[PDB]
Amino acid sequence: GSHSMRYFFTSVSRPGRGEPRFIAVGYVDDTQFVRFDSDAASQRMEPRAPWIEQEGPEYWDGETRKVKAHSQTHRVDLGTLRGYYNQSEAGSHTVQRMYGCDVGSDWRFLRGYHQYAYDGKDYIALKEDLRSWTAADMAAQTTKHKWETAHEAEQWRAYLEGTCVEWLRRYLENGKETLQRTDAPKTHMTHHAVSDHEATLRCWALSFYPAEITLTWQRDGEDQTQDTELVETRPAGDGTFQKWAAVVVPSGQEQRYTCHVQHEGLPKPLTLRWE
């Protein structure tokens, strides 16, 4: 299947006292493999998946050095942004950055991306072609003129097209047992006699990986959205995911409703039917 490596940085200024909180997390696909948290005791990049613990002390030293230097650049950014937007020093503000690379099922480069937000809104982002920038507003415009005149995109492209993909491939190999493994949803249906005349059917998908999934109801072989409720996909806590979809149905008419489950771990879609 297809793969990605991504990093998510969050930096939150603390006007009361001290310096911004900085949190980095790294993922391969839907698997978090590292983190850093500037409030934690280690002051190190730490492992969050067993396969990355196979990297030796040199790796942990280098990832720690880079992540601490990144936290500092975000600290500077928060100060500059406060000025671009004419804000007081009294308020807390948030920078977010996410960047990463995709590779197809043959592991060849598909695309890279870098996105930046201030206070929860788009600020500046790299274009698909990794060659220029998109600014959301006139502050981000100031940043974009700077970064274009200094050809900052070339380095981002060098990383996203280059080192990101090569290390992604290295993790895919090292963590094969899990990263290249698909866990199909474990599915079943429950039945809740709502009231005298109407029943709720709930179609469950459990312990699946990766998170991407589609759950769909049909009535008599046609899609049905009316009287349907679909919860947001949610972490089980052990690295897999959960989701359900429900329909309200006339009591005694359960048999005409089917639940259809699509997922990468499934050779064919599953069909569930209450009998």
Partner: peptide, 10 residues
């Protein structure tokens, strides 16, 4: 593997 410390500030 993180990128090196090459990002410019905004």
């Amino acid at each position: 593997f993180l990128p090196s410390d090459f990002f410019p500030s905004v």
